[PDB]
Protein backbone atom coordinates (compact mmCIF):
# COMPACT_ATOMS: atom_id res chain seq x y z
CA UNK A 1 0.00 0.00 0.00
CA UNK A 2 2.79 2.50 0.54
CA UNK A 3 5.67 0.09 0.37
CA UNK A 4 5.68 1.12 -3.27
CA UNK A 5 2.09 2.03 -4.25
CA UNK A 6 1.83 5.73 -3.37
CA UNK A 7 5.58 5.99 -4.04
CA UNK A 8 4.88 5.42 -7.74
CA UNK A 9 2.02 7.89 -8.11
CA UNK A 10 3.75 10.91 -6.51
CA UNK A 11 5.25 12.71 -9.48
CA UNK A 12 5.13 16.55 -9.27
CA UNK A 13 2.51 16.13 -6.58
CA UNK A 14 0.50 12.88 -6.55
CA UNK A 15 -1.94 10.99 -8.74
CA UNK A 16 -3.79 9.68 -5.69
CA UNK A 17 -4.23 13.08 -4.02
CA UNK A 18 -7.02 13.98 -6.44
CA UNK A 19 -9.38 11.74 -4.47
CA UNK A 20 -11.08 12.81 -1.28
CA UNK A 21 -10.66 9.94 1.17
CA UNK A 22 -13.86 9.04 3.01
CA UNK A 23 -12.42 6.37 5.26
CA UNK A 24 -12.50 5.91 9.00
CA UNK A 25 -8.72 6.16 9.41
CA UNK A 26 -5.84 7.49 7.32
CA UNK A 27 -5.24 7.27 3.59
CA UNK A 28 -2.24 5.06 4.30
CA UNK A 29 -4.65 2.85 6.27
CA UNK A 30 -7.42 2.65 3.69
CA UNK A 31 -4.83 1.73 1.04
CA UNK A 32 -3.83 -1.13 3.31
CA UNK A 33 -7.46 -2.23 3.13
CA UNK A 34 -7.73 -1.44 -0.56
CA UNK A 35 -4.78 -3.40 -1.96
CA UNK A 36 -5.64 -6.56 -0.05
CA UNK A 37 -9.02 -6.22 -1.68
CA UNK A 38 -7.18 -5.59 -4.93
CA UNK A 39 -5.15 -8.71 -4.25
CA UNK A 40 -8.18 -10.87 -3.57
CA UNK A 41 -10.08 -9.58 -6.59
CA UNK A 42 -7.38 -10.15 -9.17
CA UNK A 43 -6.62 -13.53 -7.62
CA UNK A 44 -10.27 -14.55 -7.82
CA UNK A 45 -10.29 -13.46 -11.43
CA UNK A 46 -6.98 -15.22 -12.13
CA UNK A 47 -8.05 -18.64 -10.95
CA UNK A 48 -11.38 -18.13 -12.72
CA UNK A 49 -9.83 -16.96 -15.96
CA UNK A 50 -7.38 -19.85 -15.75
CA UNK A 51 -10.01 -22.47 -14.95
CA UNK A 52 -12.04 -21.46 -17.98
CA UNK A 53 -8.85 -21.35 -20.01
Amino acid sequence: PDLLEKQLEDVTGNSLDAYDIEASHERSDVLRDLTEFHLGVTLYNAMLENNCS
Binding site: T12, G13, N14, D17, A18, D20
Partner: protein
Amino acid sequence: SVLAASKMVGAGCATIALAGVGAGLGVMFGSLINGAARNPNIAKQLVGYALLGFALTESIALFSLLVVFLILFA
Protein backbone atom coordinates in the same frame (compact mmCIF):
# COMPACT_ATOMS: atom_id res chain seq x y z
CA SER B 1 -12.40 67.86 28.53
CA VAL B 2 -15.00 65.08 28.45
CA LEU B 3 -15.50 65.30 24.67
CA ALA B 4 -11.78 65.14 23.88
CA ALA B 5 -11.54 62.26 26.35
CA SER B 6 -14.29 60.36 24.52
CA LYS B 7 -12.31 60.51 21.28
CA MET B 8 -9.82 58.22 23.01
CA VAL B 9 -12.03 55.65 24.71
CA GLY B 10 -14.40 55.57 21.75
CA ALA B 11 -11.75 55.05 19.10
CA GLY B 12 -10.08 52.65 21.51
CA CYS B 13 -13.14 50.42 21.77
CA ALA B 14 -13.68 51.00 18.04
CA THR B 15 -10.76 48.79 17.00
CA ILE B 16 -12.01 45.61 18.64
CA ALA B 17 -13.34 45.09 15.10
CA LEU B 18 -9.85 43.91 14.18
CA ALA B 19 -10.23 40.94 16.53
CA GLY B 20 -12.57 39.01 14.26
CA VAL B 21 -10.61 40.20 11.26
CA GLY B 22 -7.60 38.61 12.94
CA ALA B 23 -9.59 35.49 13.74
CA GLY B 24 -11.03 35.31 10.24
CA LEU B 25 -7.65 35.70 8.54
CA GLY B 26 -6.41 32.87 10.72
CA VAL B 27 -9.05 30.36 9.70
CA MET B 28 -8.69 31.45 6.07
CA PHE B 29 -4.93 31.01 6.08
CA GLY B 30 -5.46 27.76 7.95
CA SER B 31 -7.65 26.61 5.09
CA LEU B 32 -4.82 27.37 2.68
CA ILE B 33 -2.55 25.03 4.62
CA ASN B 34 -4.93 22.08 4.70
CA GLY B 35 -6.00 22.81 1.13
CA ALA B 36 -2.44 22.88 -0.16
CA ALA B 37 -1.67 19.74 1.85
CA ARG B 38 -4.52 17.93 0.12
CA ASN B 39 -3.15 18.55 -3.38
CA PRO B 40 0.14 20.46 -3.82
CA ASN B 41 -0.66 20.82 -7.56
CA ILE B 42 -3.07 23.67 -6.82
CA ALA B 43 -0.91 25.26 -4.12
CA LYS B 44 0.05 28.23 -6.29
CA GLN B 45 -3.58 28.79 -7.31
CA LEU B 46 -4.96 28.55 -3.78
CA VAL B 47 -2.58 31.31 -2.66
CA GLY B 48 -4.01 33.47 -5.43
CA TYR B 49 -7.34 32.67 -3.81
CA ALA B 50 -5.87 33.35 -0.35
CA LEU B 51 -4.82 36.90 -1.25
CA LEU B 52 -8.20 37.29 -2.89
CA GLY B 53 -9.51 36.38 0.54
CA PHE B 54 -6.87 38.34 2.42
CA ALA B 55 -7.33 41.64 0.58
CA LEU B 56 -11.10 41.35 0.81
CA THR B 57 -11.14 40.50 4.54
CA GLU B 58 -8.68 43.31 5.34
CA SER B 59 -11.29 45.63 3.78
CA ILE B 60 -13.29 45.07 6.97
CA ALA B 61 -10.12 45.92 8.87
CA LEU B 62 -9.77 49.14 6.87
CA PHE B 63 -13.50 49.80 7.20
CA SER B 64 -12.66 49.84 10.91
CA LEU B 65 -9.40 51.80 10.56
CA LEU B 66 -11.07 54.74 8.83
CA VAL B 67 -13.54 55.03 11.73
CA VAL B 68 -10.69 55.07 14.26
CA PHE B 69 -9.35 57.99 12.22
CA LEU B 70 -12.88 59.38 11.81
CA ILE B 71 -13.50 59.32 15.55
CA LEU B 72 -10.01 60.53 16.44
CA PHE B 73 -9.55 63.15 13.70
CA ALA B 74 -13.04 64.06 12.49
